[model samples]
Target: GSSGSSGGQLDLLRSNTGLLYRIKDSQNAGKMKGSDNQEKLVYQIIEDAGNKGIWSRDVRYKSNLPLTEINKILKNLESKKLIKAVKSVSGPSSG
Candidate 1:
């Protein structure tokens, strides 16, 4: 029984590792558009943000992307209803 469980765990780990590799391969392939890359970059940065969500300026700086490009990406995401922006309570703060 212990060996069976260990084998199951190993299989699970292998599956997850394969999935990770696929994701990495897709990212490296750059099958997505320039906007897609910018959008993904912004999303990742925002996802790492605390509960309050990250500011646009922060996303721009962290992504090292042009403000215009960031804004365009944000707009595209918003249009897709994948993300939303709200006014910050403290007015604005740098990340």
Candidate 2:
């Protein structure tokens, strides 16, 4: 119950100082995604991305999930208002 966090990552009621803090918070509760380590894996990739953020392409590259599932997770996190999104013009499908 101490510290500070925001924007780039506002899901936890933090005090997230960065890197390990955010993911550890999630894993500590480990209920954010609840029953899915895959989701947590994706979350980690984003959490460590800093403010520049990560792309679905790179996220997929890192997460090993399909782009469709990666997009699903990304959109889900956005809907949850956890991380802010920066859309890229380098997409492969219709916008």
Candidate 3:
């Protein structure tokens, strides 16, 4: 009985093993070149924010990146005309 339970558990883990690889591959599907991952990450956040726009601080928190780095990415995106910032009607609100 103990061996049967262990075997079942092993089978479950084996079945879920492919899920891990699928997730890993999907995550890397849109990988950017060189140091562009940060820029990509920032862009993704803003795109998800839609036209309302996201706050710099919110981006920093979501990306878990340094404020300076987030600002740098924002500048790059702005210069590329990939993203634009808009002033919020009020202070930052939780998403």
Candidate 4:
């Protein structure tokens, strides 16, 4: 039972989550630039999922959208939008 640094860590967690939420809201109210805010929501989830992992479950749950949409978003994000970010390299690592 150690709750010593929980408060400090919680500050970072809450602030980050709050900022993400607020940022999404601002985007929503700003304008229809992207033309598909639905993708924006999905894209935000992907961005927040770090530089490696992305789970459709979390994206679906948070964005309050369907798994089907997640499939579409994931496909589009990878097929094109995420190409630059995804990068390459499947073999030869210090060999």
Candidate 5:
């Protein structure tokens, strides 16, 4: 939708989608591997933060996109080296 707001959105969407498509295609081709949905949530958190992307944990928490589906998408992205997880000094602190 960002592209709909401006002329640059189309190009940006095209590039991003192209990358995603390639990643998925590669995964389908047995060229990559990685984690599941929850794991992807971890990676997505770090990836978005690094890129200054906007997102909300609550949103994902409420999303219908099953963890498995999300994880699959994330795995595909990681296969293309598009994003990654960051190790914290204390890891995930479960309070």
Candidate 6:
């Protein structure tokens, strides 16, 4: 059930990639009464992204993380200021 558990944690981590990310990713999260591998992955991803400049694509392409999960993580990271985002070069720029 590690995958299922990890998936839920992944959901949470992808939703809040800040302190929450740290909270979930830490080995401590694994030890938490209800924690599991998915949560651990979430935490690890958040931590890695902030500390190592790991991008969503990299995580997805290299690590096999789900795109839906990645998008959720990005939104959470941006909302919490744990990561910075700018207008994409190809996106329309409002002047």
Q: In lDDT terms, which candidate is top?
A: 2
Error of 1 at 82 (Å): 0.5
lDDT of 6 by residue, 1-95 (tens): 36453433333222322222222222322342222453345445656655344444555554456867656655654554434453333322343
Model 5 RMSD, rounded to 1 decimal: 14.1
For residues 1-95, write the lDDT of model 5, one tens digit per residue. Answer: 36465544443222111112111221233223454554444444444444333233322454346656655654555655755433234322342
Candidate 2 per-residue lDDT over residues 1-95, each given as its tens digit: 96676458446342322211122223333345432777778878877866656666667778899867876776666555555666445433433
Which of the predicted structures, 2 or 5, would earn the higher TM-score when compared with the native? 2
Please give the lDDT score for candidate 5: 0.41
Q: How much is 42 displaced in model 5, in angstroms? A: 12
Assess each prediction's global lDDT (C-alpha) against the native: 0.56, 0.59, 0.56, 0.49, 0.41, 0.44
What would the TM-score be for candidate 3 when compared with the true structure?
0.55
Model 2, position 56: C-alpha lDDT score: 65
Per-candidate count of clashing residue pairs (backbone under 3 Å): 0, 2, 0, 0, 1, 2
Q: Which regions of candidate 6 fall more than 4 Å away from where they truly are?
A: 1-43, 49-52, 86-95
Query: Residue-wise lDDT of candidate 1 within 11-74, one digit each (tens)?
Result: 3222111100001211333233446665677767766663646767767778899867876876
Which residue pairs show backbone clashes in model 5? 3-9
